[PDB]
Each structure stands twice: as C-alpha cells, then as structure tokens.
C-alpha cells in the first residue's frame, strides 16, 4: 500500500472537515467532497410519447416541463453501476468530462 493519488481520493483543500451526504442508491454515509456527483435534466414524459401528449393538449403554446435532479453516489455504487470506470495508471490522470 503506497499512495495511489495525489488528492488521496477526494477534493479537500485547506480545511479539516466537510459535510455528509447519503448515497442515493444504497444510503451509505459519504463525505461531500468525495461523493460522485452528476446533474441530469430530463422531461417527465418519454419523448416517444411527448408528441402524443403535445398533439392531445388543449393549451395553445404549451411546453413540456423539464426536471432538474442532482444524483450523488458512493464509490462502490458508482463503479458497480458504471458511472465511473477503473482506469489505467496513465489514464487516471485525465480530468476530461
């Protein structure tokens, strides 16, 4: 067990303690600067029915409401569900989204 990351597996810079967030999949306690975070924006009806809803509406000019949800997972759940992948030693240094 040498050290694997310069950041020790988290983003904690110049403090002692950071808040706790529950994982959404399994409900484990994870510190906020370690939890895997994503933001999704999606309609509330599938687009395969958004056309039928939009034809069968009555309001002239009506628009489909969106959704804004921030997903937060622990490392185990993220790897298991493939939000993040185990990478090569070279590839680990890439921060591109």
């Amino acid at each position: 067990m040498p050290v694997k990351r310069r950041n020790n597996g988290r983003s904690k810079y110049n403090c002692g303690h950071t808040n706790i967030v529950r994982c959404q999949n399994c409900h484990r306690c994870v510190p906020k600067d370690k939890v895997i975070k994503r933001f999704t924006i999606r309609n509330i009806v599938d687009n395969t029915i958004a056309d039928d809803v939009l034809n069968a509406c009555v309001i002239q000019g009506f628009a489909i409401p969106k959704l804004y949800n921030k997903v937060q997972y622990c490392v185990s759940c993220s790897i298991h569900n493939h939000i993040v992948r185990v990478r090569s030693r070279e590839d680990r240094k890439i921060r591109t989204p």
Partner: protein, 218 residues
C-alpha cells in the same frame, strides 16, 4: 354498495373579476339529506388555478404562475372564490439554479390596510457582466447586504399599504417584479428577481364586503 353518483349534483366555481376566464369549472357534491347541506359542505374549498388558464393567450408570461382561490360564499348556486395565495411552478423554480452564481432568499410579513396579513417570499440570482475574465459570478458581502436591504425597502414602498384587490392586480401583472429588478439592477448584474410565493397568514372571519368588491366588478 349502491353507486354514490346517483345522488350527486354539481355547482359552478367563479373567479375574481381581475381575470378574463372566470368560469373555473364545475365541482360535485352529495345532495342535501340528513344534516349536511350541500351549500354548507362545498364552502371553503380551495382551488388551484393557472394564471395562463385565467388570462389565456399570454402563455409565455403567465403559464408558470399559479393562484389559489378559495370559495367563501355560495349564492344563487354559484361559488365565489377569493384570493388565497400565490406560487410559481416547480419546473420554473428548478430551472432557476446554476452553479457559479449566488442565490439570495428573503421574506417578510406585510400587512394590508383591510385586515389581511401576508408572508411574501423573494428570490434573486447574481449574474455575469458581459466583459469579465472569470466564470463564477460570486460577489462580496458588502454587495450582498446592499441587495438584501434593497429588497426589504423596495417591497416596503410598494406593498406597505395595499388592499387585496390592488394586490391581486399587481400580482397578476408582475408590477412589483419590474421594480424589484429596477432597484436591484443598480447594484450589480442580476438575472431573475421575482416574487415566488405569497402566503395568507391570518385573515378576518367576515369577508362579505371584500368578496362583494372582488367579484362585483365595482
């Protein structure tokens, strides 16, 4: 179990004269037998009505605002609703937040000049100047304090002494939103400043004069 709708009968629901679609809809009730009078059970119902469904045609400007209208007197077999609260929609609220800007929330309890007391909730967001280096829009406390003070004193000028019908005029019009924005544009760039909710905290028991004024065009 016999079918309960063999004993049903509906009533009309009516919206204040501040609006152009005053037939909100029909409402059902069980006929009078025993001690429940139908017109002594359908009173005090609360209805939830979209502003674009009350002033139709301006969907872009009105569809994200919702009103609460409570029936408060039945006469002639008509129900007559009265101002009960204002809110914005959930997807409009969710669309407000980004990462990089600052969010300011305030509220205050505003009395009216006819016996009503309200809680009014305001939201504001910091914005990006057109020619600036950085991506974040965070601002300092010397500016945060100026914006909060501005919101307080502004809402104090406009809503300090109003009645319910004039309030409803302004709330349907966004008359207040423009001057919150006016007062707070002079301090920083800010993107969307608005009243998002109004909550009727305590009203008087007898509203017969008020509702006479609200429905009677007057």
């Amino acid at each position: 179990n016999p079918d309960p709708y063999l004993k049903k009968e509906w009533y009309p629901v009516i919206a204040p004269a501040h609006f152009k679609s005053r037939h909100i809809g029909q409402t059902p009730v069980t006929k009078t037998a025993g001690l429940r009078v139908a017109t002594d059970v359908i009173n005090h119902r609360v209805y939830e009505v979209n502003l674009g469904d009350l002033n139709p045609g301006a969907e872009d400007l009105n569809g994200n605002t919702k009103f609460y209208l409570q029936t408060q007197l039945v006469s002639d077999g008509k129900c007559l609703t009265n101002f009960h609260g204002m809110d914005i929609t959930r997807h409009k609220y969710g669309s407000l937040f980004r990462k990089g800007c600052d969010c300011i929330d305030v509220f205050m309890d505003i009395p009216t000049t006819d016996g009503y007391l309200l809680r009014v909730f305001v939201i504001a967001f910091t914005d990006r100047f057109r020619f600036q280096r950085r991506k974040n829009c965070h601002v300092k406390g010397r500016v945060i304090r100026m914006m909060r003070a501005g919101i307080y004193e502004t809402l104090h000028n406009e809503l300090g002494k109003v009645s319910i019908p004039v309030l409803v005029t302004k709330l349907s019009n966004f008359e207040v939103n423009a001057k919150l924005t006016e007062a707070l544009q002079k301090i920083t760039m800010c993107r969307d400043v608005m009243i998002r909710r109004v909550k009727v905290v305590k009203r008087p028991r007898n509203t017969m004069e008020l509702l006479s004024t609200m429905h009677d065009s007057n």
